[PDB]
Every structure is written in C-alpha cells, then in structure tokens.
Structure 1
Amino acid sequence: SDTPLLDQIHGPKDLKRLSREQLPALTEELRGEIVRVCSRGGLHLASSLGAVDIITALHYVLDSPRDRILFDVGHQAYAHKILTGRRDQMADIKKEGGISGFTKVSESEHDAITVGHASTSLANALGMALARDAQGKDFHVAAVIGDGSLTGGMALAALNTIGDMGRKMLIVLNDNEMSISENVGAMNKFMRGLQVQKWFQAVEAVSKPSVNPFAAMGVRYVGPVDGHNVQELVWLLERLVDLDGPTILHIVTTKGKGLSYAEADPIYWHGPAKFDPATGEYVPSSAYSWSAAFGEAVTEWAKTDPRTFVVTPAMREGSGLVEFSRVHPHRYLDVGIAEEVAVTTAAGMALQGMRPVVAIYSTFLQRAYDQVLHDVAIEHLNVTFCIDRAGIVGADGATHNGVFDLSFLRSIPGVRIGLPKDAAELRGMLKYAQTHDGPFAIRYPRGNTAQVPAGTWPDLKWGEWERLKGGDDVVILAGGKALDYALKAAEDLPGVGVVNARFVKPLDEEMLREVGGRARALITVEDNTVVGGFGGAVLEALNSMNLHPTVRVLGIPDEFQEHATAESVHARAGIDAPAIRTVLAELGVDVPIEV
C-alpha cells in the first residue's frame, strides 16, 4: 500500500494517535490521495491540495464533531472528508447517489455547514458561537475562509459583528492570493506586503512569551504564517483555540500545493479535466460552450461600442471573459466575490451613460436580487445581464443549480428576460439589450452551442416568439434548453406545434392569445422551478385573457435537486424529450408505442 498511515485513519480519533512528527508524512499521503481522486476530472483539485495541512492540523487539535469546523464554499475540504470516514466514498464524489463536492450537514456530523456559495462561514460561525454561549456550552468554533471568499460583503459585515460580540471563535484565513482567477481587491494587495512570521522551530514565539489588517474589527490577528508547516500549525492552534475573544489566524498557502503543474497554473487546475498525474497532460475541452459564444459576441460588440463595459464577480474564466479582458482591458472589471457590488457598480455606470454588461451565473445572481430590483429596476437603468449556468448545472448540486432566475427576475418591474435558442439569437438579444432603454436579462445553460460567424448580429423584436413546428391541436411552448427537449420530442409528431418561447418577460401576448384560444391543450417546459416561473407566467396571462385551455406545466419541482447529471435531473423532473412524449400521450396525441 502507498498510504500506510491513512489506511489506519477512519476518523479524527485515529488521527490523534499519530505523533506530531508523523503529520508531514500524512499530508503527503493525503496529497497523493487527492490527486488520484481528481484524476478522473471535474473536481476541485488545486483548492483541496492547498488546504491539506491546515485541515490536518485542525482535526489533530480540535475534537470534531463536538467542536465545529466550518468550511467556506467547501470545495477545499477533500482532505476533511478523507479524514472523517469518507475516504472510500471519494471515488464517487459529485456523482448521483455519492457524496457532495462540498460539505453538507445531512451527509456527516463532521460537516458543520452546507456550503457552495462563498462567504457564508463567518455569519454561520457567529450564530453557532452565540448559540453555544446562550446554552452555556463550551466547545470550539472554527471557520476556514479563503482570501477570495473574504472579498464578499457578507463576510466583511459578519466580521464587523464578530468583533462587536467578542465571543470565543477562531477564523483561519486561507490566503493563497487566488480566487479562481488571481484574487482582486485592496485587502489582497495589502496582504501581499505582509511578511511571514516564524513561530515554531521560534522567533515570534520568543518575542511574545506588525500591523493588524483587521485592527478596526477588534479581532486578535496572528500571522501571516506558513500554511504548509503542519507541525507549526498544530503548535499555533493549540495556543489559540482556548483564548478569549475572536481570533484570525492568517496562513499563506500555495494553491495546488504538491502537484507541480497545479502550482504553476492554479487557474486551470482549480477544476481540471481528466488528467495524467505523472505528466500533467489533460483532456482539452474541444467543445464550444455558451460561455465562449457570449465571450466572442461581447468582445466583438465592444470593438464598435465604446460604452460597453463588462463586470464579473470573480468568474472571468467561467463566464468566458478571458479574451475580452485581454482585448478590452479598460472596459473590464472584476469586483471579486461580491455580486452585490457588481450589479450596483453597473447601475452607477449606466447612470453616467455607459452600457454595462453584468456577466453572472444564475445561482450567484441570487446574491444581487435587491441590487437588481432597487438599484437597477426602479430607475429602469441600462444594465444588461448575461446569465450563464441557467437551469440545472448538475454535479455541483443544490447550492449551484440556477433554477430560480425565471421566477425572481420576472416579478421585478421592467426587467426583460430572454432565452436564446442558439448563438445567433444570443447575439440578437445582446444587440437589442445594448441599444434599448432599461434592464435586460439573457439566460443560457451550462453546455454547448454551435459557433456562428463573426459579424452575426440579427435584428429581433424583443417579446415576439417564433413558431418552429406546425400544429394547432397541442402546442409546446419552450425556450433555450427546454426548447431543445421539445423539438426532439415532437420530431416525428406532425400536428404537435412547437413555439420558441424565447422571451419570458414580456410574453408574446399576441401569439399566446391566438394559440391559447385555438389549442385544446398547451405544454410549457422550462429549465426552472415550476413555482412562479415561465409556466406561471403563461397561466397568469391566459387568466387575464379569460382563456382556459388544458395546460401541463413542466419544470423543476419545488424541491432542491441533489448532485447528478443535468440529464438525470431533467429525466426525473419530467422535462426531457421522453417525458414530454409521455405528457403528449396523456393529452391524447397519437405517440408511437414501443413494444
């Protein structure tokens, strides 16, 4: 066996039987284990490699699950799961029926919070410490937060409250100067100039038998220290966790520590495809994503429109903006993991005559709901939202599935919503949004679409649908990914109409009135919750027109969807092509049988 130490560790109690001098050897086994787990592709390799040493030290010193160790985001906690009885389950992590890619309360007593969205650890830790003190209990509360997650407003504000309440708790700042891209913000720049302190060999331990970046927060500050010296981290944690009041332990780590390729390019290796651990060679993504189609379109658009300015909250790579940031460096802004700041900054740009585009994932746009409503929509400002990862994202699970934007955006006055069927329609909607008054939202899924030639800029009338298949008996209304399912379902069914409902706000009132009055039954399909989304919009509009056709609303049920493939989620939610054919048969359509 390659891992003699790890073979005997089934939980933190087994870990504590090791001597402090054996801990370096254990971190090497953990790093080799994480590399093998991630070699199949699609996992958070570089972040978990960087956090191996602090996670080992935390479980050696603290007594989970009696003590609570909280991970911000949770993508860096693979070593945590390996050390808490889930080593064998790492083979199926993020697979349907397997363990989650992040810490999850229902999965283990050792997982203190369910995370995926960033910056929630500090407020959660405060709540647990206040609950502990209210109950007269005496356990440790520790939170691990990265330098990227620290840029979030809810982390900065929670720290302000944490310093005010002054309760016992430990915050480990896992500082690797990386978010997904290089980290941004003034705090990241300030901490670059902080010198590393040596405590255990013991210069700093002798000095206290030099500035606090959080001095105004009233929090004890220790560091920066070497985040990969596991014995020194143990030594420090033993001497900090029992002190009065809150403490920030600032550690410095190398993202991807232990794998040379990952250390050299921590951006790609944040989430690598299938790779060879011995060579670092990986399977390239030869596909053409919606993200790439958007990036090509907006990079092209900004060449002739000097008012276009793109803002992302820390997702330059995911939203497809790498080339844009290089071609238009003076029209690009990364606000860090602060969706709230991205939207309101764009509002200010629009007030001064710019045409800002907020690139943002559907699940992360949830963080900026009030900024869209209050800061953009009240004055009907020229902010365009290009919303990636719309609908089910799959393996990332319930914390990341963007199945709510058709509901929460639709109830905001003046926010137009479009679903492009292909890259040409995406360009048509982007062109319309950048040349018309008020806010526009354009949402598209994780996945691929065909490339279109440069200079593809069709004119479309916002709010008009397009019929794609003839038929007046039963008509399917769907856009985007749901439309692909609908066209596939009706592929061999003449008389089943299919309408590209490419606009959710406004609806095509004229076409819906005609189709709703002439059809005996309608089917709406959406990659979104059935609650208050596109189907609800159709029912509201039909009711206003006093039309009462039979309507089958297909979408994601009112339940969070666990990690699985999007195809599996959609099959069980009942919106894929076989499920639509089943509904068509229920409505009396002559659907061929399989026997």
Structure 2
Amino acid sequence: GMLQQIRGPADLQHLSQAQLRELAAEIREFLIHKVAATGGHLGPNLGVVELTLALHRVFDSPHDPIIFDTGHQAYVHKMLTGRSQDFATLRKKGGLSGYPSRAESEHDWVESSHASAALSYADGLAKAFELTGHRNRHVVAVVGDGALTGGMCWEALNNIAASRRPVIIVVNDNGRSYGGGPQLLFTDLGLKYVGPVDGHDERAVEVALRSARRFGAPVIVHVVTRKGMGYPPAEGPGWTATFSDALIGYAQKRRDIVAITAAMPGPTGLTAFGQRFPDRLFDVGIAEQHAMTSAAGLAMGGLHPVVAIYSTFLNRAFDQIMMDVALHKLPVTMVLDRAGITGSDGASHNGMWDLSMLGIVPGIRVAAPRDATRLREELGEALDVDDGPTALRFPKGDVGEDISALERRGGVDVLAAPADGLNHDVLLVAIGAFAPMALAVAKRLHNQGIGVTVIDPRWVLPVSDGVRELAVQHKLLVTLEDNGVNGGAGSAVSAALRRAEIDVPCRDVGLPQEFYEHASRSEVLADLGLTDQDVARRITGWVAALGTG
C-alpha cells in the first residue's frame, strides 16, 4: 500500500517507474470511491494523476510554487501533500476544501476558483522572488485548455514573455486526443514550446518538465490528458430546466433570439436550445468579457442575445455590461443562474454580488424570479425590452413552487396582506427565491400581532412606483435578499425612498458582505440567520423599537 506511505512529495523521489504506475492506480481507485461519496470534480482529477506525480517528482513545492489554474483539479496534489486521510470530509462544512487552501497547506497558493488567473499570479510571484533575491524558485502554472481561452492568459503570457524570469507554463490539455480549448495556436508565440506530451506517460511528463526547468526562461509545456482517465463513466425539477424550456418556447416564435454561454452550455441549460437552433447558440470559451461584447455586436446587428453566465463569473464582464452593452442601449438579456448562496464551492462560487454590481449600470432592468411561472413571465418581459440590457437572477436547486399573488400593484406582486384586525405595520420586500421565507416570517409575525405585507417586486431594479406607494403605507420596510447587503436590493430600495422624500425606516436583511467558507446552502443561510425564525425575531425587535428613540 504505497499511498499511505507518502508523507509528502519527497517520498516519491526514489520510487521506481513500476512503483509509480502502481501508485497512480491506487490514486485512481481512491478518487473514484472517495469523490463518488462526497461529490466533486472526479473527471478533471483522474486526468491529472500522472501530471501531478510528475510535477512533485521534478519540482520542490513550495520553494517552486505549483499554481493550479481554477484549482478544481488539485485533489491529487492534496493527496501527495499530507491530506489523503482528509477526503471523507471533502467539500463538507469544516472539511477539506474543493480548491487549494493556504490554511490547509504551505503547498497551496491560490484559493480563487475563477479560471485563467494562474499565469498572472505566476508573473507577480516571479517578479517578487527577483525583487527579494530568493535563489532558484521556479514558478509552475498548471493551466487547462479551457482556462487558456480566457483573456487573462494572453495578458499574462505577453508580460511573461517580456522577461527571462523563469515561469513554466504547463498546459493541461484534455480538449484534444494525443474539447473546449483554444482555436489559436500557441506553438509559435515567441515562447519556447515543448510537446505535445502524453500526459499519462508519467516519465515523459518528467522529461519535458526537466527540459523546461533547464531552459531557465519562460517555456510552455503542452501536456495532453484524458478527462476521467481510468473511469469509463467519467471517460427534482430545477430553475435551469424551467429557463431552458421557456427560452426554447420564446425562440421558436422569435428568430432574433440567440444564446451565448462561456463554456457552460449544459449547466446553463442552453444545450437543448442549441439542439433545436444550432446556428443560434454560441460557446465563446471561458471568456465572459467576449460573451458580453460579442452580444453587443449581435444586438448592433439586430438580434436579441440571451447571455447565460453563472452569477459569480459575471464579475469578469462588469465593464462590458457597462461600456459595450448599456452605453449603447442594446437589448441583451443576461440570465444569472447559481445566484445567491451556492455553498459547497466556497467563497469564489457564491453568486452574492450581482444585484450590487448590476445596480451601478445606468438604466439597467433586473428581475429576480420567485418561482417557475415568474421565471417564464420575467424572461418574456426581458426579451420584450428592446432599448437596453435586462437581467434575470435565480438560485441553484429545485425550482420554487408557484405562489400566485393576491394582486399586482404597479408591477409589484402582493403575496400577503395584514390579516383582519392587524394593521399595515411592516412591508417585507421579498427578493426572488426568498418569497417562501418571507411568507413564513409574515405568519410568525401575524401570531405576534404584527401586520405584514409581503411583496415580490419582480423587477427589483429600478425600484418601482409600487414599492414607493406601499412603503408610505407601512411603518417599517424590510428587504430580504439572497445577495450581499452592500449595494444590494435593500440599499437600492432605501435609496429610492429617500430620493422620493420617503423616510420610513428601512432595514437590509441579506448576506453580510463577506467571503464564506464552503458548506451546504442551507447551512450557510442558517449560520447567517437567514431563516424565517431568525428574520422574524429581528423584525419583532425593530417593530417594538419604533418611536422608542
């Protein structure tokens, strides 16, 4: 049993090639059984077993930093750096992170899962080691073919190529046979190129890595791997499926609708759209910037693009939404799935920034579906906005059960009104998927004699006349949102009331503006007090304090 004997990378040093073959087979058996139980990125990690062995046989981590781009493929790295006994807890609260973690190991450097950044870290680290006079530190960046489609890699390669400071660029390419990688050639950029190397020939990978280190300047080592290598399998109604079906339905009648994904046609629900309309689906790679600006170009050509990008990753396209789409008043609809807490993938995956970021965009119209019917209606309304950008945001998981409104008042859906004998005390503005929690809050407060109107504004931005009209009829306004509080929906509602000379007290119940550790979505929300029990308690205290000072 060799895996159990690996205390750290140096224990690989004197293994025979036969022993390394046996060890790699032990590693695959481990991954298959451990990751099947916890969930996680099985396929990408099976693909890098020999690559990771070779990296830790040639380089001296962390004196030689091994930076994983995206970081979802560092399980083998963790198993070879003292953490093989920790995988029962993988991606669980308090357990092993699904990405590298500096708190777990000195061998881990970058915790962000946002792709294509590794080479930029590498350039800065190499610059730092020169400035501090550290001898013989070899920065190694492991970059997938998908990550290599992102613009950050081009900026970093241009900067790296301007210097003889050694950076070793390991391209982990599983988009081709020895797929989702670059269409552009990177054999002739002006940087030394080694390969293509069979990334499941462990000794060949070491030979190439050793040649790269000897060269003493920037070098690209192109390694070809197979996703899921060694495991054939790898080699409840959700919001996504409701979106997919609704988009197809609208596009059957409207030929001007096109769809764009940044490398995630399946997860965004666009695969089925492309099957029906193959000429109207574009996969631009891991390139959210180009997704949005190419959408602007499509709209300048008369089309109405639907850009489906998971909330957190849309951060990369802020300036394109602002200067390429909004400045030109172009009809681009953005669909942000995985909005709000996602939980298991940690801080860099939670979609908790979109309402705050999109709120800076002049004239933007943003909707947060509360259920399946409202996702279908609001998508149709967005597709009917022809003079500027629109966005829909909704969480991962089971679609919310339909909640029909008591009445619609200036675009706002009234979901609950104060019961007879109770007054209009609290206006609870329920954003998106928090409608059920708001209704439960209203029932608890009812039992305490506190009258609550629950509304779903539908179109959260801009804040509508209906919200302002109902706000003046209540004594306290509470916004409940699955988004960071800073610049979020609650702050936007407060700002709109004050602009309208309405000074009803407002409170912003949302996610504190912090980076969250991995846990289940329900665990994160409970730890933050985003439960109907805790929210009702807070509102009780605010109501009792009214006029006390």
Answer whether TM exceeds 0.5 for this pair. Answer: yes
Given the alignment, which residue of 465, 470, 485 partners 2:412?
A: 465
Q: Which moved more, 1:77-86 or 1:550-559?
A: 550-559
Shift of 1:449: 1.3
Map of 2:426 onto structure 1: 474
Rounded to whole Å, the distance in 1 between the matches of 2:67 and 2:462 is: 43
Partners of 1:126 and 1:214 in 2: CA distance? 20
Alpha carbons of structure 1 residues 166 and 147: separation in structure 2 relative to 1, 3 Å: same
1:352 aligns with 2:325: no
Q: In the alignment, what sits opposite 2:276?
A: 327
Q: Deviations over 1:429-477 (max 9, x none)?
A: 111121222110111111111699xxxxx9x999721111102112211
Q: Which residue of 1 aligns with 2:482?
A: 527
Task: Indicate the SS of the match to 1:540.
Answer: helix
> Which residue is equivalent to 1:430?
379
Choose the corresponding residue for 1:401, options 322, 328, 350: 350
1:497 aligns with 2:453: yes
Question: 1:184/1:14 Cα in 2 relative to 1: closer, same or farther (>3 Å)?
Answer: closer
CA separation of 1:462/1:162 partners in 2, compared to 1, >3 Å: closer, same or farther? farther
1:100-136 Cα shifts (integer Å, max 9, x gaps): 1011223311012123011011111111111111222
| Letter of the structure 2 residue corresponding to residue 468 of structure 1 | L
Match of 1:250, SS state, is strand
Spell out, residue by residue over 1:176-219, the C-alpha distance to the aligned partner (whole angstroms, 9 max, x if none).
107xxx315523xx6xxxxxxxxxxxxxxxxxxxxxx3323x21
Q: TM-score, normalised by structure 2?
A: 0.93
* Partner AA of 2:433 in structure 1: K
* Structure 2 unaligned residues grouped into runs of 5+: 419-423, 545-549
Q: Does 1:548 align with 2:519?
A: no
Displacement of 1:154: 0.7
Q: Which residue of 2 aligns with 1:248?
A: 220
Is 1:44–2:41 an aligned residue pair? yes
Residues 127-526 of structure 1 mapped to structure 2, 5 A cutoff:
127-137=124-134, 138-177=136-175, 182-183=179-180, 185-187=182-184, 213-216=186-189, 218-263=190-235, 287-436=236-385, 437-449=387-399, 464-471=411-418, 472-494=424-446, 495-508=451-464, 510-526=465-481
Greater Cα shift, 131-140 or 397-406? 131-140
Q: Who is 2:547 aligned against?
A: none
Query: In 2, Cα distance between the equivalents of 1:247 and 1:71?
Result: 17
Q: 1:344 to 1:143 in 2, by over 3 A?
A: same
SS state at 1:39 partner: helix
Letter in 2 for 1:576: T
Q: Would the aligned equivalents of 2:38 and 2:90 in 1 still touch at CA under 8 Å? A: no
Contact 1:417 1:442 in 2 (8 A): yes
Cα distance in 1 for partners of 2:90, 2:123 equals: 29
SS in structure 1 of the partner of residue 215 of structure 2: coil
Contact between 2:194 and 2:220, CA under 8 Å: does it hold in 1? yes
The 1-side partners of 2:277 and 2:378 are apart by 21
Aligned-partner Cα distance in 2 for 1:491–1:462: 22
Give the CA deviation at 1:41: 4.8
From the superposition, tell whether residues 576 and 45 of structure 1 become closer, same or farther in structure 2 (CA, over 3 Å).
Answer: same
The one-letter code matched in structure 1 to 2:166 is: K
CA 1:150/1:31 → structure 2, altered by over 3 Å: closer, same or farther? same
- Within-5 A mapping of 1:547-586: 547-586=502-541
Q: What code does the residue aligned with 1:543 have?
A: R
Task: Describe the shift of the 1:468–1:100 C-alpha distance in structure 2 as closer, same or farther (beyond 3 A).
Answer: same
Q: How many residues align?
A: 529
Q: Secondary structure at the match of 1:490?
A: helix
CA distance in structure 1 between the aligned counterparts of 2:367 and 2:4, rounded to whole angstroms: 53
Q: Partners in 2 of 1:184 and 1:52 — Cα distance?
A: 20
The structure-2 alpha-carbon separation of the partners of 1:159 and 1:20, relative to structure 1 and needing over 3 Å to count, comes to: same
Once the two structures are TM-superposed, the CA of residue 364 in structure 1 deviates from its matched residue by 0.8
**Structure 2 residue aligned with 1:70:** 67
Q: Secondary structure at the match of 2:472?
A: helix
Q: What secondary structure does 1:150 align onto? A: helix
- Per-residue CA deviation, residues 397-417 of structure 1 (Å, 9 max, x unaligned), is 111111011001011101110
Match of 2:83, SS state, is coil
- CA-atom RMSD, angstroms? 2.0
**Distance change >3 Å, CA 572–CA 451, structure 1 → 2:** closer
What is the CA–CA distance in structure 1 between the aligned matches of 2:111 and 2:38, rounded to whole Å? Answer: 23
Task: Answer with 86-95 or 542-551: which moved more.
Answer: 542-551
- The answer for the alignment partner of 1:273 in structure 2 is none
Give the TM-score, by structure 1 length: 0.86
Percent pairwise identity: 43
Contact 2:378 2:458 in 1 (8 A): no
Shift of 1:492: 4.9
- Give the secondary structure class of the aligned counterpart of 2:309: strand
Structure 1 residues 145-178: Cα deviation after superposition (integer angstroms, max 9, x where no partner): 1100000011122112211223212111111107
- Give 1:578 shift: 1.8
Aligned partners of 1:219 and 1:245 also within 8 Å:
no
Contact 1:21-1:231 within 8 A present in 2 as well: no
Structure 1 SS opposite 2:530? coil
- CA shift for structure 1 position 514: 3.0
SS of aligned partner of 1:356: strand
User: For the residues of structure 1 that align with 2:393 and 2:114, how far apart are their CA atoms?
Assistant: 19
SS in 2 for 1:64: coil
Distance 1:246 1:328, change over 3 A: same
CA distance in 1, matches of 2:22, 2:65: 26
CA contact (8 A) 1:23 1:231 kept: no
Contact preservation (8 Å) 1:474, 1:519: yes
Amino acid at match of 1:318: P
| Matching residue's letter, 2:212 | L
* 1:107 alignment partner, SS class: coil
On the 8 A contact 1:432/1:462 being kept in 2, the answer is: no
Q: How far off its partner does 1:579 sit?
A: 1.6
* SS of equivalent to 2:460: strand
How far does the alpha carbon of each residue in 1:475-496 deviate from its partner, in whole angstroms, 9 at most, with x for none? 2111212222111222354322
Q: Is the 8 A contact 1:172 1:249 kept in 2?
A: yes
Does the CA-based 8 Å contact 2:431-2:479 persist in structure 1?
Answer: no
State the distance in 2 between where 1:519 and 1:507 align.
17
Letter in structure 2 aligned against 1:481:
A
Q: Is the contact between residue 102 and residue 114 of structure 1 (CA under 8 Å) also seen in structure 2? A: yes
Alpha-carbon deviations, 1:58-117, whole Å to 9, x = none?
111111121100001111111001111111111111111112101122331101212301
Deviation string for 1:8-33 (max 9, x for gaps)?
Answer: 11211222242344211111111111
1:421 and 1:560 map into 2 onto residues whose CA distance is 25
Aligned residue in 1 for 2:80:
83
Q: Answer yes or no: is the 8 Å Cα contact 2:145–2:181 preserved in 1.
A: no
Instruction: Name the aligned partner's letter for residue 257 of structure 1.
Output: M
Contact 2:345 2:518 in 1 (8 A): yes
Amino acid in structure 1 at the alignment position of 2:434 = A
Q: Rate the CA distance shift 1:451–1:530 in 2: closer, same or farther, 3 A.
A: closer
